[PDB]
């Protein structure tokens, strides 16, 4: 068809849901990292005889 230009197909609902899910997943992974680090910090005293 002549006289019409096609735009993008970026769905905003999908983008918003993806951002929410990404933020929540990032926070969960940061919490896991903190837990593991604290556990190793507590565990690295056994070596004291």
């Amino acid at each position: 068809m002549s006289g019409v230009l096609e735009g993008s197909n970026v769905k905003p609902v999908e983008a918003m849901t993806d951002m929410i899910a990404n933020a929540r997943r990032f926070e969960m992974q940061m919490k896991v990292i903190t837990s593991v680090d604290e556990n190793e910090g507590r565990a690295n005293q056994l070596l004291s005889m």
């Binding site: 190793e40 565990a43 690295n44 056994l46 070596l47 005889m49």
Partner: protein, 106 residues
């Protein structure tokens, strides 16, 4: 010498404990080297062999991506145990030497 035969077992046990302590500390130090295998010795068999070293690979527990099989918890417990047994061997050897001494003092 007869004096060596009495103190041979404890001296060999003490030396083997020191060697295994060095091996465990090497395992701890190289924890971050990718591709490093955790090595250890079987204390009883080597003690038989010396009284009458070969390094054995540790069986990995968790598969890492960089090929490092060193586990923190297992070797930390083994390190503490080896330290305790080294102290016990020192205590036993010192007691034997002190007894041999008080036999002579007079």
């Amino acid at each position: 010498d007869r004096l060596d035969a009495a103190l041979r077992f404890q001296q060999e046990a003490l030396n083997l404990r020191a060697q295994r302590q060095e091996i465990l500390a090497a395992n701890i130090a190289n924890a971050d080297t990718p591709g490093y295998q955790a090595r250890d010795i079987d204390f009883a068999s080597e003690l038989k062999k010396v009284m009458v070293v070969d390094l054995l690979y540790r069986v990995p527990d968790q598969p890492s991506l960089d090929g490092n099989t060193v586990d923190m918890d297992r070797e930390r417990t083994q390190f503490a145990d080896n330290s305790l047994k080294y102290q016990m061997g020192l205590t036993v050897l010192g007691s034997q030497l002190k007894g041999m001494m008080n036999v002579l003092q007079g």
